[PDB]
Amino acid sequence: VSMTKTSVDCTMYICGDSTECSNLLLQYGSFCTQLNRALTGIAVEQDKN
Amino acid sequence: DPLSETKCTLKSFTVEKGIYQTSNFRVQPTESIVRFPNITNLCPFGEVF
């Protein structure tokens, strides 16, 4: 009926506490959000299910 | 304030009734420590250079 709701701080995954990396991750634009939206969508659907 | 941070995350001046994920948080480092072994003696760079 459900699976474990998983959320990721994408920025912590990719750039783990580095300001330099995080400033480089901005050069990829919205992908850090687009992933968090998709995972939050999955997580809400577990309560719906 | 947290409401303005939602208006930001949603790119809208009006917010519908809900719970909204916004900019994640981390406890910041309070101080820095450095721990190298207490070797006192400068290296023999003399007779090599």
Curated annotation (Swiss-Prot), chain B:
Source taxon at top rank: Viruses
Glycosylation sites: 30, 32, 38
Outcome of swapping residue 38 to Q: Reduced viral infectivity
Region (Disordered): 26-42
Assembly behavior: Binds to host ACE2. RBD also interacts with the N-linked glycan on 'Asn-90' of ACE2. Cleavage of S generates a polybasic C-terminal sequence on S1 that binds to host Neuropilin-1 (NRP1) and Neuropilin-2 (NRP2) receptors. Interacts with host integrin alpha-5/beta-1 (ITGA5:ITGB1) and with ACE2 in complex with integrin alpha-5/beta-1 (ITGA5:ITGB1). May interact via cytoplasmic c-terminus with M protein. May interact (via N-terminus) with host bilirubin and biliverdin, thereby preventing antibody binding to the SARS-CoV-2 spike NTD via an allosteric mechanism.
Function: Attaches the virion to the cell membrane by interacting with host receptor, initiating the infection. The major receptor is host ACE2. When S2/S2' has been cleaved, binding to the receptor triggers direct fusion at the cell membrane. When S2/S2' has not been cleaved, binding to the receptor results in internalization of the virus by endocytosis using host TFRC and GRM2 and leading to fusion of the virion membrane with the host endosomal membrane. Alternatively, may use NRP1/NRP2 and integrin as entry receptors.
Protein name per its UniProtKB record: Spike protein S1
Organism: Severe acute respiratory syndrome coronavirus 2 (2019-nCoV)
Portion of the full-length sequence here: 294 to 342 of 1273
